[model samples]
Target: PEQLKHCNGILKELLSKKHAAYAWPFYKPVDASALGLHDYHDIIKHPMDLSTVKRKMENRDYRDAQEFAADVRLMFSNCYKYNPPDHDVVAMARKLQDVFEFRYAKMPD
Candidate 1:
């Protein structure tokens, strides 16, 4: 419950911003019948977030949810680390690469 609230709060805060500061802004194209969302409050969020949160909610899997949140945060961190300007940054890149080797164990091949 608390984690879902956190996720929802993060999403709402991101969507409320008029401008996008990051690469992946919380901007889903407005689709009326497909998503049944017409306004800001109706944003359905991305599939990754929705699925991860759904598994946590429906299956009552706390560890999975926490790991998914960590992965989400890590992905954002990596995106900022590996970009066009600071393209040479390698510390986070290497660390992320190393993490990826082990992290895949948690995910299916």
Candidate 2:
């Protein structure tokens, strides 16, 4: 039990660090300007907290790549707003591909 608790703590800490780095939809004014994201710079006056995204993934709530990619598309709407015909979703899906085939895969569907 102690070991499992320790493992969970480690994972929770990792998710916290990740959320800090990649908090979505809000960039510092300077950083946004530098990245030429002036639209978001003026519009996103407040940062959006994406703790839900981290929680869902960490809790293994996603059923497959399509489901995950749909969330990714929503979370990163700024990047996807242009409707650019790119492989961004595919790339994101591939990163989590192995998780779909893991032992827990037998739970449903």
Candidate 3:
């Protein structure tokens, strides 16, 4: 429960405009239906699950800022206890790399 409290705190922090600017891209396109989220409050209060988080992250199904924040919260809540599959992690890494390159790539001098 303590960890969940911490996770909710982090989720709230990330939902702020300042944090959303950078964090949003990393957590887009989550499936609200899959998570049983019927509304904004549901997204905020949904129970965190380790495997579900990994599955969503691996599939890149995050739909919006709220769901993405939940996914991040869920990940941190269980990251140490749950070891996500290597391929899924690697795939997510690849996507992040691509995002970074796309955002920060410079023209050849």
Candidate 4:
């Protein structure tokens, strides 16, 4: 909550100072890379597409937070998927934080 407030403050300032420049850019054609969503069987998918990430940064339509999160997750997931975390600390922490939160909250324990 506090962090969001801080973000809101900064964003408000940005809007006041540079709304046109900072605000979300108009939708453009998502390149073949962005649209061609892959699974655990493909190349890396970056968290923020330079082309599309601006949508959120600029306060554009984010009625799809899940999609946005997925994009970010994919970027990192692709890199780590092939090379599963070797350290127990990293593995456990990520599992507990990301995978556990979503799964336990939504599905059976």
Find the candidate with the highest lDDT and give its number. Answer: 3
Candidate 4: misplaced stretches above 4 Å? 1-42, 45-55, 59-61, 87-109
Q: How many residue pairs clash per model?
A: 0, 0, 7, 2
- For candidate 4, list the clashing residue pairs, or say none: 24-58, 45-75
CA shift of 86, model 2, Å: 20
Ranking by lDDT: 3, 2, 1, 4
Q: Candidate 1 on 1-109: residue-level lDDT in tens?
A: 5545554444343334332333222133223457453442333233233334344545655454356456445544533433444553334334433443344334432
TM-scores vs. true structure, each candidate: 0.33, 0.29, 0.28, 0.31
- The candidate maximizing TM-score is 1
Candidate 3 residues 2-107, lDDT tens each?
Answer: 3333333444444446544444433443345774645634334444433454455456565533464455544433322332445454444344334433422231
Better of 1 and 2 by TM-score: 1
Each model's lDDT: 0.41, 0.41, 0.42, 0.39
> Which segments of model 2 are wrong by more than 4 Å?
1-50, 78-109
Order the numbered candidates by TM-score, best leading. 1, 4, 2, 3
Deviation (Å) of 3 in candidate 1? 2.7
RMSD of each: 11.9, 9.1, 14.7, 11.8
Candidate 3, overall lDDT? 0.42
Global CA lDDT of candidate 2, please?
Answer: 0.41
